[PDB]
Short mmCIF file of all heavy atoms in Angstrom, two decimals:
data_model
loop_
_atom_site.label_atom_id
_atom_site.label_comp_id
_atom_site.label_asym_id
_atom_site.label_seq_id
_atom_site.Cartn_x
_atom_site.Cartn_y
_atom_site.Cartn_z
N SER U 1011 -43.05 -82.89 14.90
CA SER U 1011 -42.29 -82.10 15.84
C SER U 1011 -42.95 -80.76 16.09
O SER U 1011 -43.86 -80.32 15.39
CB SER U 1011 -40.88 -81.84 15.33
OG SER U 1011 -40.14 -83.03 15.22
N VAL U 1012 -42.47 -80.08 17.11
CA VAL U 1012 -42.72 -78.64 17.27
C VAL U 1012 -41.30 -78.02 17.42
O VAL U 1012 -40.40 -78.68 17.88
CB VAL U 1012 -43.64 -78.36 18.48
CG1 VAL U 1012 -42.94 -78.59 19.79
CG2 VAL U 1012 -44.16 -76.95 18.41
N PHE U 1013 -41.15 -76.79 16.95
CA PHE U 1013 -39.86 -76.15 17.06
C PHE U 1013 -40.05 -74.85 17.83
O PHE U 1013 -40.42 -73.82 17.28
CB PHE U 1013 -39.25 -75.88 15.69
CG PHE U 1013 -38.68 -77.12 15.09
CD1 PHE U 1013 -39.38 -77.83 14.14
CD2 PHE U 1013 -37.41 -77.54 15.45
CE1 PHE U 1013 -38.85 -78.96 13.59
CE2 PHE U 1013 -36.87 -78.64 14.89
CZ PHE U 1013 -37.59 -79.36 13.96
N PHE U 1014 -39.75 -74.90 19.11
CA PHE U 1014 -39.98 -73.78 20.01
C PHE U 1014 -38.66 -73.34 20.64
O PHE U 1014 -37.81 -74.15 20.95
CB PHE U 1014 -40.98 -74.13 21.08
CG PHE U 1014 -40.58 -75.21 22.02
CD1 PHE U 1014 -40.03 -74.90 23.27
CD2 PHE U 1014 -40.75 -76.54 21.71
CE1 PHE U 1014 -39.66 -75.87 24.13
CE2 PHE U 1014 -40.39 -77.52 22.59
CZ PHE U 1014 -39.82 -77.21 23.79
N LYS U 1015 -38.55 -72.02 20.79
CA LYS U 1015 -37.38 -71.43 21.40
C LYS U 1015 -37.64 -71.33 22.92
O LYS U 1015 -38.79 -71.50 23.37
CB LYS U 1015 -37.17 -70.07 20.80
CG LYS U 1015 -35.81 -69.46 21.00
CD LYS U 1015 -35.74 -68.09 20.38
CE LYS U 1015 -34.35 -67.50 20.61
NZ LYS U 1015 -34.29 -66.09 20.19
N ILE U 1016 -36.59 -71.16 23.69
CA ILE U 1016 -36.74 -70.99 25.13
C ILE U 1016 -37.41 -69.67 25.46
O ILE U 1016 -38.32 -69.60 26.28
CB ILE U 1016 -35.39 -71.13 25.87
CG1 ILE U 1016 -34.94 -72.60 25.85
CG2 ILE U 1016 -35.42 -70.60 27.26
CD1 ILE U 1016 -33.58 -72.79 26.46
N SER U 1017 -37.02 -68.60 24.78
CA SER U 1017 -37.53 -67.28 25.11
C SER U 1017 -38.96 -67.03 24.59
O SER U 1017 -39.45 -65.91 24.75
CB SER U 1017 -36.57 -66.22 24.57
OG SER U 1017 -36.50 -66.26 23.20
N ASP U 1018 -39.58 -68.01 23.97
CA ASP U 1018 -40.99 -67.88 23.58
C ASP U 1018 -41.91 -68.14 24.76
O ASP U 1018 -41.44 -68.42 25.86
CB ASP U 1018 -41.28 -68.87 22.43
CG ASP U 1018 -40.71 -68.47 21.12
OD1 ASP U 1018 -40.53 -67.26 20.89
OD2 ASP U 1018 -40.42 -69.37 20.28
N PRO U 1019 -43.22 -67.99 24.59
CA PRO U 1019 -44.15 -68.65 25.52
C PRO U 1019 -44.01 -70.18 25.41
O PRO U 1019 -43.47 -70.67 24.43
CB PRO U 1019 -45.53 -68.19 25.01
CG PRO U 1019 -45.25 -66.89 24.47
CD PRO U 1019 -43.91 -66.97 23.81
N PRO U 1020 -44.49 -70.93 26.42
CA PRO U 1020 -44.33 -72.39 26.40
C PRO U 1020 -45.05 -73.02 25.21
O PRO U 1020 -46.14 -72.57 24.80
CB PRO U 1020 -44.96 -72.83 27.72
CG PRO U 1020 -44.88 -71.67 28.58
CD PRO U 1020 -45.08 -70.49 27.70
N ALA U 1021 -44.43 -74.02 24.63
CA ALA U 1021 -45.01 -74.68 23.44
C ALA U 1021 -46.22 -75.46 23.85
O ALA U 1021 -46.38 -75.86 25.00
CB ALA U 1021 -43.99 -75.60 22.84
N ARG U 1022 -47.09 -75.71 22.90
CA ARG U 1022 -48.36 -76.37 23.19
C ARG U 1022 -48.93 -77.01 21.92
O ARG U 1022 -49.25 -76.32 20.93
CB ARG U 1022 -49.36 -75.33 23.70
CG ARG U 1022 -50.72 -75.99 23.90
CD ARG U 1022 -51.72 -74.99 24.45
NE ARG U 1022 -51.49 -74.66 25.83
CZ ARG U 1022 -52.21 -73.74 26.48
NH1 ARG U 1022 -53.17 -73.09 25.85
NH2 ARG U 1022 -51.96 -73.53 27.75
N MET U 1023 -49.03 -78.32 21.96
CA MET U 1023 -49.74 -79.05 20.92
C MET U 1023 -50.83 -79.89 21.60
O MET U 1023 -50.81 -80.10 22.83
CB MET U 1023 -48.83 -79.96 20.13
CG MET U 1023 -48.40 -81.16 20.90
SD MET U 1023 -47.30 -80.73 22.20
CE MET U 1023 -45.87 -80.34 21.22
N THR U 1024 -51.80 -80.34 20.82
CA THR U 1024 -52.93 -81.09 21.31
C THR U 1024 -52.98 -82.45 20.68
O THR U 1024 -53.25 -82.54 19.47
CB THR U 1024 -54.22 -80.32 21.08
OG1 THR U 1024 -54.21 -79.14 21.86
CG2 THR U 1024 -55.41 -81.15 21.52
N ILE U 1025 -52.68 -83.50 21.44
CA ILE U 1025 -52.70 -84.84 20.92
C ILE U 1025 -54.12 -85.36 20.98
O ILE U 1025 -54.74 -85.34 22.04
CB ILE U 1025 -51.76 -85.73 21.79
CG1 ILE U 1025 -50.38 -85.17 21.75
CG2 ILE U 1025 -51.85 -87.12 21.31
CD1 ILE U 1025 -49.52 -85.75 22.74
N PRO U 1026 -54.71 -85.79 19.85
CA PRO U 1026 -56.13 -86.14 19.85
C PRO U 1026 -56.42 -87.46 20.50
O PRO U 1026 -55.56 -88.06 21.15
CB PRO U 1026 -56.46 -86.17 18.36
CG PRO U 1026 -55.22 -86.52 17.71
CD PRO U 1026 -54.11 -85.91 18.52
N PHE U 1027 -57.66 -87.95 20.39
CA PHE U 1027 -58.02 -89.26 20.91
C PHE U 1027 -57.30 -90.34 20.08
O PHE U 1027 -57.72 -90.65 18.96
CB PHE U 1027 -59.50 -89.45 20.90
CG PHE U 1027 -59.94 -90.80 21.30
CD1 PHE U 1027 -59.77 -91.20 22.60
CD2 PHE U 1027 -60.48 -91.68 20.38
CE1 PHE U 1027 -60.10 -92.45 22.97
CE2 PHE U 1027 -60.81 -92.93 20.78
CZ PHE U 1027 -60.64 -93.31 22.07
N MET U 1028 -56.31 -90.95 20.68
CA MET U 1028 -55.19 -91.57 19.96
C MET U 1028 -55.34 -93.10 19.87
O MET U 1028 -54.42 -93.79 19.47
CB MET U 1028 -53.90 -91.19 20.67
CG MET U 1028 -52.63 -91.21 19.85
SD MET U 1028 -52.63 -90.04 18.52
CE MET U 1028 -51.46 -90.86 17.48
N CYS U 1029 -56.48 -93.64 20.27
CA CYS U 1029 -56.64 -95.07 20.46
C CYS U 1029 -57.29 -95.75 19.26
O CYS U 1029 -57.77 -95.10 18.33
CB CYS U 1029 -57.49 -95.31 21.71
SG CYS U 1029 -57.80 -97.07 22.05
N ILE U 1030 -57.28 -97.06 19.34
CA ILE U 1030 -57.87 -97.90 18.28
C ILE U 1030 -59.33 -98.12 18.60
O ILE U 1030 -60.20 -98.09 17.73
CB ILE U 1030 -57.11 -99.21 18.18
CG1 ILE U 1030 -55.63 -98.97 17.92
CG2 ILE U 1030 -57.70 -100.04 17.09
CD1 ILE U 1030 -54.68 -99.09 19.12
N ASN U 1031 -59.63 -98.37 19.88
CA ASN U 1031 -60.98 -98.65 20.36
C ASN U 1031 -61.72 -97.34 20.52
O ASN U 1031 -61.22 -96.25 20.20
CB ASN U 1031 -60.91 -99.37 21.71
CG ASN U 1031 -60.26 -100.74 21.61
OD1 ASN U 1031 -60.50 -101.48 20.68
ND2 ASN U 1031 -59.41 -101.05 22.58
N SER U 1032 -62.89 -97.43 21.08
CA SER U 1032 -63.73 -96.22 21.22
C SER U 1032 -63.46 -95.51 22.53
O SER U 1032 -64.11 -94.46 22.79
CB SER U 1032 -65.19 -96.58 21.11
OG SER U 1032 -65.42 -97.19 19.83
N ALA U 1033 -62.54 -95.99 23.35
CA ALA U 1033 -62.24 -95.40 24.66
C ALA U 1033 -60.92 -95.93 25.16
O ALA U 1033 -60.44 -96.98 24.71
CB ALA U 1033 -63.32 -95.69 25.68
N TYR U 1034 -60.31 -95.21 26.08
CA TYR U 1034 -59.11 -95.67 26.76
C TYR U 1034 -59.46 -96.67 27.86
O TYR U 1034 -60.16 -96.30 28.80
CB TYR U 1034 -58.30 -94.53 27.34
CG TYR U 1034 -57.57 -93.64 26.37
CD1 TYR U 1034 -58.12 -92.47 25.98
CD2 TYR U 1034 -56.35 -94.00 25.87
CE1 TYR U 1034 -57.48 -91.64 25.12
CE2 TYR U 1034 -55.71 -93.18 24.96
CZ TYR U 1034 -56.27 -92.01 24.62
OH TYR U 1034 -55.61 -91.18 23.74
N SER U 1035 -59.01 -97.90 27.74
CA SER U 1035 -59.14 -98.85 28.81
C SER U 1035 -58.13 -98.49 29.88
O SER U 1035 -56.95 -98.75 29.76
CB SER U 1035 -58.92 -100.29 28.31
OG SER U 1035 -59.91 -100.66 27.42
N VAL U 1036 -58.59 -97.76 30.92
CA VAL U 1036 -57.72 -97.48 32.03
C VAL U 1036 -57.36 -98.75 32.78
O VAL U 1036 -56.18 -99.01 33.05
CB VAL U 1036 -58.37 -96.48 32.98
CG1 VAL U 1036 -57.46 -96.17 34.14
CG2 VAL U 1036 -58.70 -95.23 32.24
N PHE U 1037 -58.34 -99.58 33.07
CA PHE U 1037 -58.15 -100.90 33.63
C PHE U 1037 -58.41 -101.95 32.58
O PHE U 1037 -59.43 -101.86 31.93
CB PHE U 1037 -59.02 -101.10 34.85
CG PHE U 1037 -58.62 -100.27 36.02
CD1 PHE U 1037 -59.28 -99.09 36.30
CD2 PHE U 1037 -57.60 -100.64 36.85
CE1 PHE U 1037 -58.90 -98.35 37.37
CE2 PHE U 1037 -57.21 -99.89 37.89
CZ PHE U 1037 -57.88 -98.75 38.16
N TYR U 1038 -57.48 -102.85 32.46
CA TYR U 1038 -57.53 -103.93 31.47
C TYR U 1038 -57.39 -105.22 32.23
O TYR U 1038 -56.41 -105.39 32.96
CB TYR U 1038 -56.43 -103.76 30.45
CG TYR U 1038 -56.47 -104.65 29.23
CD1 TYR U 1038 -57.38 -104.42 28.21
CD2 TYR U 1038 -55.59 -105.70 29.07
CE1 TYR U 1038 -57.40 -105.22 27.07
CE2 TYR U 1038 -55.62 -106.51 27.97
CZ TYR U 1038 -56.52 -106.26 26.98
OH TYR U 1038 -56.54 -107.09 25.87
N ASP U 1039 -58.36 -106.11 32.12
CA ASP U 1039 -58.35 -107.39 32.85
C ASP U 1039 -57.79 -108.50 31.98
O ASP U 1039 -58.00 -109.66 32.25
CB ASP U 1039 -59.77 -107.72 33.29
CG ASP U 1039 -59.81 -108.67 34.47
OD1 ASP U 1039 -58.75 -109.12 34.95
OD2 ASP U 1039 -60.94 -109.04 34.89
N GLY U 1040 -57.04 -108.15 30.95
CA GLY U 1040 -56.59 -109.18 30.07
C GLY U 1040 -55.10 -109.25 29.85
O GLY U 1040 -54.30 -108.70 30.65
N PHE U 1041 -54.70 -109.89 28.79
CA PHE U 1041 -53.32 -110.23 28.47
C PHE U 1041 -53.03 -109.82 27.06
O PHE U 1041 -53.90 -109.95 26.17
CB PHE U 1041 -53.14 -111.75 28.63
CG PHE U 1041 -53.11 -112.21 30.07
CD1 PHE U 1041 -53.67 -113.44 30.41
CD2 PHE U 1041 -52.64 -111.41 31.08
CE1 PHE U 1041 -53.68 -113.86 31.72
CE2 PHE U 1041 -52.64 -111.84 32.38
CZ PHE U 1041 -53.15 -113.07 32.67
N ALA U 1042 -51.86 -109.27 26.83
CA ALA U 1042 -51.53 -108.80 25.48
C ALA U 1042 -51.13 -109.92 24.56
O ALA U 1042 -50.52 -110.91 25.02
CB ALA U 1042 -50.42 -107.75 25.56
N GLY U 1043 -51.50 -109.81 23.31
CA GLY U 1043 -50.99 -110.69 22.28
C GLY U 1043 -51.52 -112.10 22.22
O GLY U 1043 -52.72 -112.28 21.96
N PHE U 1044 -50.67 -113.08 22.43
CA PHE U 1044 -51.08 -114.50 22.33
C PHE U 1044 -50.51 -115.35 23.45
O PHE U 1044 -51.16 -116.30 23.90
CB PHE U 1044 -50.62 -115.06 20.98
CG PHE U 1044 -50.97 -116.51 20.78
CD1 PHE U 1044 -52.28 -116.89 20.48
CD2 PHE U 1044 -49.99 -117.50 20.92
CE1 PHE U 1044 -52.62 -118.24 20.31
CE2 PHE U 1044 -50.34 -118.85 20.75
CZ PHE U 1044 -51.66 -119.22 20.42
N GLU U 1045 -49.31 -115.02 23.93
CA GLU U 1045 -48.60 -115.92 24.81
C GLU U 1045 -49.17 -115.84 26.24
O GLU U 1045 -49.99 -114.97 26.59
CB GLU U 1045 -47.11 -115.55 24.85
CG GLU U 1045 -46.37 -115.87 23.52
CD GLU U 1045 -44.95 -115.43 23.55
OE1 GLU U 1045 -44.57 -114.66 24.47
OE2 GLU U 1045 -44.17 -115.84 22.64
N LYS U 1046 -48.73 -116.78 27.06
CA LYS U 1046 -48.92 -116.66 28.51
C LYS U 1046 -47.95 -115.70 29.15
O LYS U 1046 -48.11 -115.33 30.30
CB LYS U 1046 -48.75 -118.03 29.17
CG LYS U 1046 -49.85 -119.03 28.87
CD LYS U 1046 -49.65 -120.32 29.68
CE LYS U 1046 -50.79 -121.30 29.48
NZ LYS U 1046 -50.88 -121.83 28.10
N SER U 1047 -46.95 -115.22 28.38
CA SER U 1047 -45.95 -114.24 28.86
C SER U 1047 -46.43 -112.81 28.72
O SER U 1047 -45.70 -111.87 29.11
CB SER U 1047 -44.64 -114.45 28.12
OG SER U 1047 -44.78 -114.14 26.75
N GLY U 1048 -47.62 -112.58 28.14
CA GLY U 1048 -48.14 -111.24 28.05
C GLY U 1048 -48.50 -110.74 29.42
O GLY U 1048 -49.27 -111.42 30.15
#
């Protein structure tokens, strides 16, 4: 969490490179999981 008041300056955190792979797949040509319902 962050705990910020309204009367402060705006809160700011930095979420890092959050993925499993080496890059974010913006476009994915595949299907999730195992099923045909992915």
Side-chain angles (χ1 to χ4, degrees):
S1011 296
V1012 71
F1013 283 98
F1014 64 98
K1015 198 182 179 187
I1016 286 174
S1017 64
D1018 285 332
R1022 175 180 287 175
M1023 75 290 288
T1024 295
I1025 301 167
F1027 175 69
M1028 204 64 203
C1029 179
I1030 304 100
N1031 297 318
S1032 301
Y1034 288 98
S1035 295
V1036 180
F1037 290 98
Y1038 189 76
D1039 201 1
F1041 288 145
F1044 179 76
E1045 290 176 350
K1046 291 184 174 68
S1047 66

